[PDB]
Design a protein around this ligand. Structure first.
Ligand SMILES: COc1cc2c(c3oc(=O)c4c(c13)CCC4=O)[C@@H]1C=CO[C@@H]1O2
Ligand SMILES: COc1cc2c(c3oc(=O)c4c(c13)CCC4=O)[C@@H]1C=CO[C@@H]1O2
Ligand SMILES: *[C@@H]1O[C@H](CO)[C@@H](O)[C@H](O)[C@H]1NC(C)=O
Ligand SMILES: *[C@@H]1O[C@H](CO)[C@@H](O)[C@H](O)[C@H]1NC(C)=O
Ligand SMILES: *[C@@H]1O[C@H](CO)[C@@H](O)[C@H](O)[C@H]1NC(C)=O
Ligand SMILES: *[C@@H]1O[C@H](CO)[C@@H](O)[C@H](O)[C@H]1NC(C)=O
Ligand SMILES: *[C@@H]1O[C@H](CO)[C@@H](O)[C@H](O)[C@H]1NC(C)=O
Ligand SMILES: [Cl-]
Ligand SMILES: [Cl-]
Ligand SMILES: [Cl-]
Ligand SMILES: [Cl-]
Ligand SMILES: [K+]
Lengths: 530, 532
């Protein structure tokens, strides 16, 4: 009844789930597209054909085919991000948490997972929607989308592997929410999309893309923006990588069509085993198959779109963590370790800036180096480690987001900026890594509310503050509830943002302005010039 | 007879001068070269021909022909640097202060004035040698040399205007000291050369130049070094400037000989009037006629000599003042004034940067701007004013000196480095200007020892220890008296890079003087400008 919902493509049977000494409705693994399998691998998604009988939506779906991180087997900090379900190319499903009793026509929030466009699943423990749905009385959807080659292999000109299909999967799940969320007590005219890292880049891509604009009301971007240097490639670079993928797998390369058909015969894991090989450099925070600037999903370059105001004009709320870079150093840079303080020698710092800014010539490397080195104390391994962490975080996440926020604000209808800098109580990773990539997510999804998870009282209270900011923003375009201490609008002139931690709200201005002028104005001009 | 000296070119009669209620001997205006006048303008100097009779050396000589600053008429802060004598091309003279009674074979110090190679005089109040010679028992000499076109017009290939003749004037006075100072009870094997700004750059050029090396024992450089961006030009640029000078005066330019002949027939003032017109750019801290890298006085590039250790190996003492740039902003950059706190707008900061680094491409200007701008507070008038001051000082004096001292220390026999950061209590310049270019000189020359000049007792104590450092260094190669219980000025070393503050407070040792900004100026900027 409450659990039996007739949607436009057929009937779905949800399940009653327990949540914090209460209950709500969960509809898990709802198909939004035809399975993109067989001759459909690499192609645009097709809408899910209607089924008869009742779809069993009591259970999480398969995760998409992806690289699986095995660097630290057994370790919760890496393993929480890996698939917790069987992987299958048949993976285009969404999940819904509905407050019980069913609300009339409430704010909808649609979560878009990150994972670098090469991994991610809607079914991770940290994305369990039941807490945010219950606490904030919203309808929470998590979508999925193809990642890696399967989602982003790009041979522009071909209708067979056009590129961007993972982005179209997201848009098709959005369309499905627009067409069906009213059946779950959701208001399709009050949809917020939100996601982290690649999911945040994704959110900003749908703001930019004219085909996505009318499928949501408002947006939240966490530690990601569309212009991130790792978040897109040119059609020529996507093409090179796709030919190199085929080269790796002994494919016929005489034609797009021959390459594409060879690659469709390959077992999924065969694609995944060689995925990292197509990258043009030794690097970190670079992923193989990502969105392409194709002239279709994105009519023109992201920069020209941002400058002309060719994008959705609405309210956005976005921000970054203190130490975005540290996870990536740990994986790919010399001298770093999970099990030590990771004091970085000068030799390893040099080799790290090269890996961090793989597109830089020698002059740009020197420029980066000079900008983050304290020459009164250059053999300090602690300042060398933190310096590298800041390079990776500033270059890849913070400064692109600041460029996006400054460009967006000129045209949009209200910007709210945050700086997430809370030090964990349950320290999973070592201290040197600080406020890690993805850590704010636990707070957004209300995991600190679960007593069995052993967060502190101050963390429960912060999670509740964050959920309420997020949901209130989703409802109104403003994270603040009229009447009382206010998170102020980010404005072009004043550039105010807030810290998000367990202390009373403090307001600052010009987040990392000094390093971000280096990354957004001077380096690009140096690289354009030399 | 103490006052009557027979030198190698003739007799000299000096004068008993009073000093701090004692007396010493002064020999003022001794000629060391033929008057470089007439057909000798621009030529290498020639040794002074022996004269008959007794040379009256009781009064200061003429000052060399030079641009005279009159931005601030009647103002002692600018006017103290202008010629206080009649100007003449007949100007190659030296001055000597000798303790009374005459010492046997004592330490010699020889002062080389600054003034950007376009100005300066041995006769200024602030260079009065009597305080230092008396107090430290040293034989103190001040030399002179031709400045501006007269000293530095450079037409490489001609032996009529070869360039660097002002440096050869200095060499010749050094040679004269070498040959004659024994007659004044000086030891010619213990000569320290010292000078400020262009004077300091000159000292460094003598260190480098094979033809000067054997003419002094060791060297002090104040706020200047040979590698300063303003202190030299290429043969090509010297030539361009000499020809631009001709063009300004409607000279015949068809050949060097015609150009030089034309320029020799002009009155000195005609050259001076257009002197500033030959500079390639609108600029700050740039001077028209300066030493040229010729392949003679300088066998190869300053940088290649410094790297190979092709230069005099000895002891050096050197340093800088806290605000080297301020004087130069006052004169040429927009929004500066001596009668206001000179809060600088963003727009005038951008203009100042361009004037300060006139050789820079757009990208280079951007790097300078970025390196010196607080983007949390980019409209701060005070931070923009100080930023500009730091740029001008870091680029023109501090970072070149630091590059020099690092390069020198690899091969030399002892380096002592100072940072002078005392602002004098009786300064007539506004506070914003801080510790100005040239203002350590009066301490070096012991002016705070005169009660009527109204310095503090702390300023007197400071001047006494500066003079004692300088002279003790001149005597021994080490500013410290061994066995003394005093705070010790440590050697500057490649590894530790130590220096001292010189001020009215107890001594503090620091390390890596302005290392952050000087890596930018000495490594990153040139690499960037050299890029295309
Ligand atoms: C096999 O090489 C890589 C493996 C890898 C990553 C990588 O992230 C990167 O940014 C990156 C590489 C990575 C190789 C080159 C590169 O840039 C993820 C980080 C954490 O887990 C993921 O596992
Ligand atoms: C006519 O232009 C100038 C006059 C001038 C100076 C200058 O110093 C400079 O560094 C400079 C100029 C100067 C013009 C261009 C330049 O760089 C001395 C400063 C103070 O007194 C001197 O007088
Ligand atoms: C849906 O699946 C679960 C187990 O996978 C089962 O317990 C539930 O009853 C199913 N619903 C059906 C078969 O109608
Ligand atoms: C949003 O648009 C409204 C309605 O036109 C307008 O009043 C206001 O200027 C905008 N709000 C912001 C914060 O830009
Ligand atoms: C959390 O705390 C409980 C109660 O003290 C304890 O029994 C348990 O070991 C902790 N759980 C986890 C998953 O760390
Ligand atoms: C030398 O010149 C001075 C000053 O003009 C004069 O007073 C003095 O009498 C002269 N001495 C001799 C010996 O002629
Ligand atoms: C200077 O030279 C002498 C003679 O070789 C040597 O003993 C001394 O160590 C040198 N001192 C320095 C500080 O280089
Ligand atoms: Cl629960
Ligand atoms: Cl605004
Ligand atoms: Cl007196
Ligand atoms: Cl050493
Ligand atoms: K085909």
């Amino acid at each position: 009844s409450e659990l039996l919902v007739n949607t436009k493509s057929g009937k779905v049977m949800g399940t009653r789930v327990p949540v914090l000494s209460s209950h709500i409705s969960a509809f898990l693994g709802i198909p939004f597209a035809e399975p993109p399998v067989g001759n459909m691998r690499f192609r645009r998604p097709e809408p899910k054909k209607p089924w008869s009988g009742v779809w069993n939506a009591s259970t999480y779906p398969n995760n998409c085919q992806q690289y699986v991180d095995e660097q630290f087997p057994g370790f919760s900090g890496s393993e929480m991000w890996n698939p917790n379900r069987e992987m299958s190319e048949d993976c285009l499903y969404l999940n819904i948490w509905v407050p019980s009793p069913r609300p009339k026509s409430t704010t909808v929030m649609v979560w878009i997972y990150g994972g670098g466009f090469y991994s991610g699943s809607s079914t991770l423990d940290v994305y369990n929607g039941k807490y945010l749905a219950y606490t904030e009385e919203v309808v929470l959807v998590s979508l999925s989308y193809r990642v890696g080659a399967f989602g982003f292999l790009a041979l522009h000109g071909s209708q067979e592997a056009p590129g961007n299909v993972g982005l179209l999967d997201q848009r098709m799940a959005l369309q499905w929410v627009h067409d069906n969320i009213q059946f779950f007590g959701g208001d399709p005219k009050t949809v917020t999309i939100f996601g982290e890292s690649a999911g945040g880049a994704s959110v900003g891509m749908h703001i930019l893309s004219p085909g996505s604009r009318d499928l949501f009301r408002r947006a939240i971007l966490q530690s990601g923006s569309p212009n991130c240097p790792w978040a897109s490639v040119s059609v020529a670079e996507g093409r090179r990588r796709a030919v190199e993928l085929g080269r790796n797998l002994n494919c016929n390369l005489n034609s797009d069509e021959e390459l594409i058909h060879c690659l469709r015969e390959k077992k999924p894991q065969e694609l995944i085993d060689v995925e990292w090989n197509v990258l043009p450099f030794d690097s970190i925070f670079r992923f193989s198959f990502v969105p392409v600037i194709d002239g279709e999903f994105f009519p023109t370059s992201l920069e020209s779109m941002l400058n002309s105001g060719n994008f959705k004009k609405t309210q956005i709320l976005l921000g970054v963590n203190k130490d975005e870079g540290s996870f990536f150093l740990l994986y790919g840079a010399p001298g770093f370790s999970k099990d030590s303080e990771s004091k970085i020698s000068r030799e390893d710092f040099m080799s790290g800036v090269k890996l961090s800014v793989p597109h830089a010539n020698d002059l740009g490397l020197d420029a980066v180096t000079l900008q983050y080195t304290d020459w009164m104390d250059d053999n300090n391994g602690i300042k060398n480690r933190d310096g590298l962490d800041d390079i990776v975080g500033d270059h890849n996440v913070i400064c692109p987001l600041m460029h996006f926020v400054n460009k967006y604000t000129k045209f949009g209808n209200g910007t709210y900026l945050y700086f997430f800098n809370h030090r964990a109580s349950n320290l999973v990773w070592p201290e040197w890594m600080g406020v890690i990539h993805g850590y704010e997510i636990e707070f957004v999804f209300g995991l600190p509310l679960v007593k069995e998870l052993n967060y502190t009282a101050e963390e429960e209270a912060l999670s509740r503050r964050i959920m309420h900011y997020w949901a209130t923003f989703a409802k109104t375009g403003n994270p603040n509830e009229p009447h009382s201490s206010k998170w102020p609008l980010f404005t072009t002139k004043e550039q105010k943002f807030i810290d998000l931690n367990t202390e009373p709200m403090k307001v600052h201005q010009r987040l990392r302005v000094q390093m971000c002028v280096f990354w957004n104005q001077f380096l690009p001009k140096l690289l354009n010039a030399t």
